[PDB]
Amino acid sequence: MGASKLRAVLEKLKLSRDDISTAAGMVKGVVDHLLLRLKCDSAFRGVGLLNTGSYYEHVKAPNEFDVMFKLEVPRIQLEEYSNTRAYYFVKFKRNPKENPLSQFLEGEILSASKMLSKFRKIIKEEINDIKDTDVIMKRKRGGSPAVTLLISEKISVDITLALESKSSWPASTQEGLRIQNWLSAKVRKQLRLKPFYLVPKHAKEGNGFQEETWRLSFSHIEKEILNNHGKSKTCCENKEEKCCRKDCLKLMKYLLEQLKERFKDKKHLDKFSSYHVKTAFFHVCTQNPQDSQWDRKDLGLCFDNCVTYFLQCLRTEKLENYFIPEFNLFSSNLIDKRSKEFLTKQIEYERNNEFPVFDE
């Protein structure tokens, strides 16, 4: 696949400033209103908008948004659930004083399902006729921590609640974030000093679910790594140091998106998301730390590599969480073999035929 061809694909995917500003405007309005109302409750008094960009989370329908609501919770003690390395029970190190979330305390362990239920109930109750815009809440997805809204019957916004911990990161993230040879150890050091988040996601237990667990989240770190991606600090700040990392990520995401859209009737690709792609891309970034390995003239090659590695992850059924190395996103427990084989087939076909799926 030619680099000029790929860059032409990315070129035709660019949206005008008007659409971006309009959609961002509507989303911002709804979000701000929901914050102002969410602060009416003592449990969600310290709620706030977490900076993850909140834009460009969909190349092309680019009306789908993703915002994250951080909730500052002080002095929490985490307990790793069944060595899942990613799912924890939330407790409090010292709780003599009445906790704002005490209404959600199922004993010593903070209930995730109750907080999520309350959150969803507040939002659902306060998106009706209070807005000079038409907002509807989408059907509750199975085991999804997100609360999705539809604005003006065109804009989708995923709202995820997240507990915030300014404590040091869990021990499961010790060997994670291998950006030493890429973004330097100093950057990793200052990054690990930043807080980490927890989303109300239950873990699988054979043929049952816990609903009391929370999953680690480092979306903000992902944003930071994304916007500052070069070994050189001046990467992509001049013509001589223009790389093709972001182009590769965009192309991968668009490939997965187009494949998911094409086989929407089937249920094979439903569990696959742009996060898997992003993770694989991060691993590839670790494998190729030099900016010279991401030269803009080698877009075709680099992207190819990004495809190949992704395929490897599908074939070997191994895709380690970039922050939690022992957490496998492509385990057989999460995604079945048949789905991964299907995706593999579609991708191999696309690459073998000069990506006809980009022609739309």
Ligand SMILES: Nc1nc2c(ncn2[C@@H]2O[C@@H]3COP(=O)(O)O[C@H]4[C@@H](O)[C@H](n5cnc6c(N)ncnc65)O[C@@H]4COP(=O)(O)O[C@H]3[C@H]2O)c(=O)[nH]1
């Ligand atoms: N900003 C943010 N949103 C999250 C996070 N975790 C879940 N969400 C939201 O809930 C939706 C479904 O969550 P799921 O955990 O039940 O299945 C997810 C999960 O299995 C996996 N995944 C996505 N982000 C992940 C993440 N940050 N960590 C671990 N797994 C993740 O891919 C599935 C679909 O992701 P999606 O990006 O299209 O939408 C998320 C996403 O909009 C999160 O950590 N950060």
Ligand SMILES: [Zn+2]
């Ligand atoms: Zn760059």
